[PDB]
Amino acid sequence: PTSLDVTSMTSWEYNWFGADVIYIAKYYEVRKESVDVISYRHPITGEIAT
Amino acid sequence: PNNLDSNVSQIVLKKFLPGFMSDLVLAKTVDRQLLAGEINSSTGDSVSFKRP
C-alpha cells in the first residue's frame, strides 16, 4: 500500500485535490569510500593511465 | 597486612543501559488532514464539520 511522508505544512485549498495525493522524497548522501585504482602503463600513445 | 583501598577510586561510566519502548500505530493510521491547522485556543474550544 501507499504511505505518504509527513506534510505538516498545510494548504488552504483542500478538496483532497482529487481523492488523494502521496508525497515521496529523494535522499542524497555523500560518503568517503576506499577504492582501488589500477594503473595501466602501456607505452603506446602515452604511458601513465590510472 | 596491606590496606591500600585508598589508592583507587569508584568510577561510574558515562554509559546508559538500553531501556524499554512502545509502538506508534494509531497516531499514524488516524486521519489528520481535516483537523490540522483549524483549531485556535484564542478563537474557541470547539470546531464543526458538515455531514453529507
Next chain:
Amino acid sequence: SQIVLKKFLPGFMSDLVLAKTVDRQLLAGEINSSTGDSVSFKRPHQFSSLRTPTGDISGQNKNNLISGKATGRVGNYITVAVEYQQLEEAIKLNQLEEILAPVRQRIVTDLETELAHFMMNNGALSLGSPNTPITKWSDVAQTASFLKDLGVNEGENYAVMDPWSAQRLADAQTGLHASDQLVRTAWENAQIPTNFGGIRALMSNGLASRTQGAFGGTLTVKTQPTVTYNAVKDSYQFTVTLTGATASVTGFLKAGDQVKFTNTYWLQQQTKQALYNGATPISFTATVTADANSDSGGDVTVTLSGVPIYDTTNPQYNSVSRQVEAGDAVSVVGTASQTMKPNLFYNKFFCGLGSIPLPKLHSIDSAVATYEGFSIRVHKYADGDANVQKMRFDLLPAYVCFNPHMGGQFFGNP
C-alpha cells in the same frame, strides 16, 4: 544644598596577601560536575628498615603498605543582596555601576577573612608566648629555623605580620651599622626587604582576631587515645578527653587554642630524632578545631588537628617521641580570655583555595565581574510588581588542608 557632585568620595579597603600566597595550583577546575562536591589527593609513603647480620633470611617480617588521603571540599555561598526601588536608584545613577565598586570589595574581603580563620583553625605548629608582641629579629627568624628543622624544603615559606609590628622591625633595621642601602631604605620608606631572616615576610592590615576563652585548673588526660596510622591516616585529626577542669563553664575552649603536651616531643620526620631548641626540647602542640564546653566534674571532650602518631606495629609513620597515655600533663597557651590578632607562618603546600564557576539562571539577566582572578556572578530580577528590583552577587569557594604539620601561629618571645 541641591548641587551634588557626581563623583563619589573615597573610602576604605584592606589588602590581599593570603589568596595570592596560598597554593592555587592543585585545586583548580577539579571540582567539576562529575567529581561531586569533594575530591582527595594522595599521600607519600614511608618505610622502616631492619638490622640483622645474616643474609639467607629471605623469609622474615616485612613492611606494610598503607595509603592515605587528603580530602578537599566546597564551602558556603558568599552572597550579598540589596533590595531597593530601582527608579529611585536610577534617578541619579547611570547603569547602576556605583553599587559595583564597594561590593566586589565585600565579597573579596570576606573570602580572605574565611581563609585566615581556616589557616588559623587548622594550623598546628605554635611558637612564642601570645602576650609578647614582635620586637626583634629572632622573633621572625625562629619560624624559618623551626621550618628548616622539621625538614621541609620543597616549596617556599611565608610570614604575615600586622602593620604596627613592621614599624618596629624597620625601626630596628635603622639601627644597623654597615648596610647603607638598608639604612637608607628603612629611613625613607620604613620598608623591610623581601626575604627577612630566611623567610618571605609580609605586612597586612586585614587579618583575623580571636579570643582565648575562659579556662582554669591543672588539666591532664583521662583516657588513652588511639593515634595509630590506620585510625588517623585520612584526616590527621583525633579526639581526646581531659579531666581536672573547672566545674561548669560554657565556652571552655574556643576554636584556635593551642594545647601543649609536656612530655611528648617533635621528631625530625626523616631521621626520627628529637628536636632541641637551644636549651630545652620542643614539646608537641595541637589546635582546637570546634568549640568545647565543660560539664560537671571537670571533663572536657575535644577534637584536635595534628596527631602524635606512635604506632607500634607500623613504626615508619611515627611523628612523636612517646605515646600519649593516661596521667600525662598538658597545658594551654596564653591567658584566660584575652583577645589578640595572631601572626601567621606557613609553607606553600599547607592549605589550598579554589573557585567553582556558577552557571547562568534561566530567563534572568546576569553578568560576570572579574576582580584579581575571582569571578563574581551578578544576577538581577524584579519579583513582585511593587517596583522592588533585586540584585545579587555570588561566589563559591572550596578549601583543602594538605598537611597540618607545616604551618600554624607564632608570636614574640622574651
